């Protein structure tokens, strides 16, 4: 099942988009007192609320993140969902073997909704990029809320939570006993050999 949790936020400067920076036009725009106020407030406030409640959902647990490993699941091969090692250091996580597929096998449709680089627009040597041209019109795309690093920390912690069993000193249980515990929640298990595992 797939559920969307965020949308790339876009903010627009009302004065630059309508007047192109012409000084005379800016004075005429003041007659439309509530026109720009409504447009800027709606885009700015919606983006801040979106980033506020997304950051509330992203919890982390260092204890559970350590258990996101193939050695913690036994016969259940979770290698396709655990995070990848930090290939270049300076970080604690990375994309799983399924996240990079969904993020790359899907079309690289960078036709405008790119949080492109702003520091090269005003001092660059080459003619302006398609993204810089939008920035000159006051349309600027903010960086995505769901950061790539926070995602791997968040998902890695949740996957590792399934290996926790409430043991003293945080010892990890065999994963065959985690499934048995969740089966007992359905109906009290009377089988002793546990061959059904």
């Amino acid at each position: 099942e797939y559920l969307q949790i965020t949308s790339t936020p876009i903010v627009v400067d009302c004065s630059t988009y309508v007047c192109n920076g012409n000084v005379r036009c800016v004075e005429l725009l003041k007659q439309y007192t509530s026109a720009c106020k409504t447009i800027e407030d709606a885009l700015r406030n919606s983006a801040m609320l979106e980033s506020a409640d997304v950051s509330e959902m992203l919890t982390f647990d260092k204890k559970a993140f350590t258990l996101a490993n193939v050695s913690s699941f036994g016969d259940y091969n979770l290698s396709s969902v655990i995070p990848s090692l930090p290939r270049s250091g300076s970080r604690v996580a990375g994309r799983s073997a399924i996240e990079d597929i969904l993020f790359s096998k899907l079309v690289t449709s960078g036709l405008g909704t790119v949080d492109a680089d702003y520091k090269k627009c005003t001092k660059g040597l080459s003619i302006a990029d398609l993204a810089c041209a939008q920035y000159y019109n006051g349309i600027m795309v903010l960086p995505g809320v769901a950061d790539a690093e926070r995602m791997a920390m968040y998902t890695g912690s949740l996957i590792g939570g399934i290996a926790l069993g409430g043991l003293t000193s945080a010892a990890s249980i065999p994963f065959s006993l985690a499934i048995q515990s969740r089966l007992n929640y359905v109906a009290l298990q009377t089988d002793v050999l546990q061959e059904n595992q």
Partner: peptide, 20 residues
Amino acid sequence: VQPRNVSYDSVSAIVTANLS
């Protein structure tokens, strides 16, 4: 902004072990 640190819950296992 670093993620909020919390302690996740767990499903107590039916084991012969040392339990908290």
